[PDB]
Amino acid sequence: PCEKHSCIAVIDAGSTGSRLHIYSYDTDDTNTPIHIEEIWNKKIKPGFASIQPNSVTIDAYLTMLLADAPIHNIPVYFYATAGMRLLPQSQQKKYYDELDYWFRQQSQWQLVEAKTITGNDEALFDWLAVNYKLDTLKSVQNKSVGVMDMGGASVQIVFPMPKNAEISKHNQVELNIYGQNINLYVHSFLGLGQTEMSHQFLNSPSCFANDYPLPDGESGQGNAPSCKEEVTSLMNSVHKVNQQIQPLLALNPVNEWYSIGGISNLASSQLFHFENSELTNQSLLQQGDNQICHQQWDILNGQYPDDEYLYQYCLLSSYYYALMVDGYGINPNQTIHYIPPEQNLDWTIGVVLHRA
Amino acid sequence: PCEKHSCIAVIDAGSTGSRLHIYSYDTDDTNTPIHIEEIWNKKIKPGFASIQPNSVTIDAYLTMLLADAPIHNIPVYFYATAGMRLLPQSQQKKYYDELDYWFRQQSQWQLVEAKTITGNDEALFDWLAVNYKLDTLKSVQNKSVGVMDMGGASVQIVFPMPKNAEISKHNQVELNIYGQNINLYVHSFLGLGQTEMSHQFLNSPSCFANDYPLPDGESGQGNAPSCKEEVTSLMNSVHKVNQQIQPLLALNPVNEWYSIGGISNLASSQLFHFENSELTNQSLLQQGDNQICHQQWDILNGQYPDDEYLYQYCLLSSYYYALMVDGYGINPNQTIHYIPPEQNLDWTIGVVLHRA
Ligand code: NA
Numbered sequence: 001p002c003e004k005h006s007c008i009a010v011i012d013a014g015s016t017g018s019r020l021h022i023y024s025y026d027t028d029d030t031n032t033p034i035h036i037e038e039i040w041n042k043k044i045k046p047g048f049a050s051i052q053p054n055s056v057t058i059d060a061y062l063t064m065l066l067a068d069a070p071i072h073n074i075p076v077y078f079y080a081t082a083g084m085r086l087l088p089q090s091q092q093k094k095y096y097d098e099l100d101y102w103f104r105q106q107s108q109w110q111l112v113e114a115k116t117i118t119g120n121d122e123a124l125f126d127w128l129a130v131n132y133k134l135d136t137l138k139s140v141q142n143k144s145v146g147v148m149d150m151g152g153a154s155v156q157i158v159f160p161m162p163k164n165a166e167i168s169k170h171n172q173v174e175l176n177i178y179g180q181n182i183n184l185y186v187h188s189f190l191g192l193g194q195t196e197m198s199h200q201f202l203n204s205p206s207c208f209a210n211d212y213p214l215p216d217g218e219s220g221q222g223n224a225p226s227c228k229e230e231v232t233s234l235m236n237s238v239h240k241v242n243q244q245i246q247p248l249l250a251l252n253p254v255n256e257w258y259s260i261g262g263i264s265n266l267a268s269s270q271l272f273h274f275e276n277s278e279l280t281n282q283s284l285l286q287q288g289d290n291q292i293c294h295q296q297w298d299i300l301n302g303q304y305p306d307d308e309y310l311y312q313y314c315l316l317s318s319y320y321y322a323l324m325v326d327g328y329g330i331n332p333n334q335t336i337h338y339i340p341p342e343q344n345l346d347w348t349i350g351v352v353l354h355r356a
Numbered sequence: 357p358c359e360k361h362s363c364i365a366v367i368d369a370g371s372t373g374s375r376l377h378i379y380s381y382d383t384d385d386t387n388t389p390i391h392i393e394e395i396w397n398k399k400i401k402p403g404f405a406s407i408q409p410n411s412v413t414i415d416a417y418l419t420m421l422l423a424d425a426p427i428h429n430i431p432v433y434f435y436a437t438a439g440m441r442l443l444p445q446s447q448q449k450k451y452y453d454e455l456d457y458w459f460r461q462q463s464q465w466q467l468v469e470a471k472t473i474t475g476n477d478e479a480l481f482d483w484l485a486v487n488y489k490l491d492t493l494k495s496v497q498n499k500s501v502g503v504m505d506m507g508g509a510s511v512q513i514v515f516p517m518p519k520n521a522e523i524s525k526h527n528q529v530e531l532n533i534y535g536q537n538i539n540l541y542v543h544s545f546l547g548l549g550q551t552e553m554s555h556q557f558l559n560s561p562s563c564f565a566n567d568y569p570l571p572d573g574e575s576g577q578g579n580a581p582s583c584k585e586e587v588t589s590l591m592n593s594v595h596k597v598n599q600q601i602q603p604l605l606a607l608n609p610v611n612e613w614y615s616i617g618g619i620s621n622l623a624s625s626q627l628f629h630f631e632n633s634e635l636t637n638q639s640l641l642q643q644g645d646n647q648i649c650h651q652q653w654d655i656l657n658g659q660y661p662d663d664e665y666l667y668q669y670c671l672l673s674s675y676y677y678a679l680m681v682d683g684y685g686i687n688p689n690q691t692i693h694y695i696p697p698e699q700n701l702d703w704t705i706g707v708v709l710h711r712a
């Protein structure tokens with residue numbers, strides 16, 4: 001396949017593991033990739049930031065990730081995300097030093113770049129990946145498409161916005177895709193991903209089902225509106241999500257919202273019911289409140305003993321609402337599309353489009 | 357030594373590693389331990405909550421921790437703290453199931469209890485340990501002693517307070533030590549430990565030295581008062597530290613404050629100068645502001661290339677001030693004693709006093 005087409009490997013070194021994607025593609029007369037096809041996909045655990053940065057450990061890890069790969073001599077991008085951003089730069093440097101050394105010795109993998117990408121770059125790739133799959137990149141669009149990525153340690157938001165001298169250059173991207181100039185606003189909130197966020201609310205009774213045992217000895221007494229208010233304080237009083245994002249969405253309205261990441265998992269669980277891979281925040285909060293927050297934990301756990309994430313669904317439904325409604329200012333009745341978890345839609349497609 | 361005296365093993369399964377303490381002690385006629393002496397101390401890495409909960413991994417870990425121990429057949433308490441509290445109960449259960457099995461097979465270690473203790477219990481042990489070392493437990497005291505424990509994932513505060521029907525039973529302890537009844541208020545804030553807290557402020561320029569590279573591409577521009585205000589929002593708007601603690605300290609004044617944990621490390625570094633193992637918050641903030649926040653990172657890093665924690669000292673000095681002054685309501689001019697890091701003062705002494 002890499003015989004008659006171009007090929008690229010992109011490694012997503014994420015929070016819970018690393019995923020190797022190998023893509024074939026052709027290039028059109030705008031110097032933009034087309035016919036992007038994933039020819040190989042392998043995931044290993046644990047996350048890169050959770051292993052020791054030495055030559056023995058890195059070799060085992062990278063050998064495991066790449067060894068069976070049926071396609072050999074191709075350029076590689078190794079991109080780590082928020083899990084690595086949480087580590088001191090001096091600690092990150094150890095990983096990248098070892099990784100450069102490992103790839104040098106491999107005559108079959110040509111390492112182009114290995115780095116911890118910013119949340120802003122991640123947001124750019126998120127937007128490219130979704131829009132590529134919706135087939136909205138090829139021609140100048142009537143409608144504005146926004147993407148929200150709901151990650152473990154960070155969340156990203158990205159939408160079209162003309163160049164603005166009053167906004168940090170770090171929050172703005174310019175790119176040309178299929179011959180058209182695009183200007184995007186990008187933002188990442190490090191610490192507001194669901195795992196990192198959750199560590200501030202583990203002892204909040206309003207955020208767990210009735211009688212759920214909290215770490216410090218109290219009991220769950222769930223109430224989604226109360227939990228949502230607690231989470232909103234982290235969003236707005238600490239991160240100032242509302243102050244930063246709402247003015248920009250007011251002035252640069254989004255016609256269609258697409259969400260990727262954790263929300264797709266929650267919405268696709270047996271506890272929530274949504275049609276057409278779409279939800280509204282109003283519905284999400286109401287369902288979380290009724291089906292989890294105000295249930296008895298023992299009864300709930302007995303009906304669904306196989307979902308290890310169930311216990312968190314009161315907090316998560318409250319958190320998504322706090323983020324989208326209280327943070328981003330999205331109307332509770334606004335349709336939000338979520339990309340089905342089973343779908344071969346991954347942010348690494350954006351790396352192909354932008355960097356291949 | 358366990359020949360003529362009682363002995364107990366206490367394992368502190370903490371965030372960055374586990375520390376085995378073996379103590380000899382005698383018992384006085386109030387049924388209280390006396391002459392508590394540490395006869396063995398071993399620490400291993402990493403933290404218990406960071407390893408896989410299976411029989412092979414647990415065996416290697418526990419064998420490593422206990423194998424060389426020169427003293428054999430004695431009761432063991434295995435107590436995990438905030439690192440384990442961050443994990444789902446279902447995940448914690450796997451560890452404790454494996455740990456029970458491992459200890460059953462060892463005829464030389466009699467496992468009494470293995471559990472994740474609450475922050476409230478941790479706070480109790482903190483207070484007992486400090487007061488044992490200050491020799492203030494043996495007789496009825498004129499003065500009120502308070503303890504603050506500044507941990508990686510949680511912080512604890514503990515001080516005398518009579519039984520109060522208006523306060524959760526979980527935040528109050530009754531105990532009898534050296535024949536005297538004691539009543540303590542205990543509180544733990546999970547998520548407010550320095551590591552967990554820091555994950556919300558990694559992109560805050562006010563919290564890092566000038567030109568320090570932040571993960572999302574901006575540059576440090578340190579200012580301790582501004583950083584302190586950011587951290588205070590997490591303390592008070594999210595955790596409500598001020599609302600919960602300040603009324604209680606007003607009504608139950610503390611005459612002497614002792615702090616353990618991270619503050620001792622910061623204060624004992626080459627960048628800060630304090631006498632008599634005492635600081636004031638005013639001085640801590642001023643020193644952090646002048647010696648780190650408003651320094652050029654390149655110059656600072658060049659003078660102290662061996663302190664891997666240096667880059668965080670603007671944030672940490674700001675955070676301790678936010679916690680003690682804006683959270684707990686302590687006057688910026690109030691003397692705070694910190695226990696020297698080199699000192700053999702550990703919270704596990706409290707387990708001996710309370711449980712042996
Ligand atoms: Na190579």
Ligand code: NA
Nearest residue numbers: 459460462465
């Ligand atoms: Na045993």
Ligand code: NA
Nearest residue numbers: 196199552555
């Ligand atoms: Na965290």
